[PDB]
């Protein structure tokens, strides 16, 4: 149930979300990839008085330093292919 916790939190309102483009995404819109969580937990999120969200970027900054100088897992799910997927990303 750690795929399923990771959409509830993706699909809660409307809001601001985190995505992973690729070098061709801005040129070609036909892959659309959410970032869904960070080293396998949900992207932590804040839900406002009027049922919109925004990330916890306190956090968020916390689960990046602990990666300076290292590699952070970003968890994706794709929207369209449906798919989870790990990507990696070096955090100066
Ligand atoms: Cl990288």
Same mark, same amino acid.
């Given at each position: 149930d750690d795929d399923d916790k990771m959409l509830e939190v993706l699909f809660q309102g409307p809001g601001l979300? *985190?995505?992973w483009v690729d070098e061709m995404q801005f040129q070609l819109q036909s892959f659309f990839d959410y970032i869904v969580g960070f080293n396998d937990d949900p992207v932590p999120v804040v839900s406002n008085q009027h049922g919109f969200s925004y990330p916890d970027y306190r956090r968020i900054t916390? *689960?990046?330093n602990?990666?300076?100088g290292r590699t952070l897992?970003?968890?994706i799910w794709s929207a369209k292919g449906g798919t989870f997927?790990?990507?990696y990303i070096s955090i100066i």
């Open positions: 979300r *985190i995505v916390s *689960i990046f602990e990666h300076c897992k970003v968890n997927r790990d990507e």
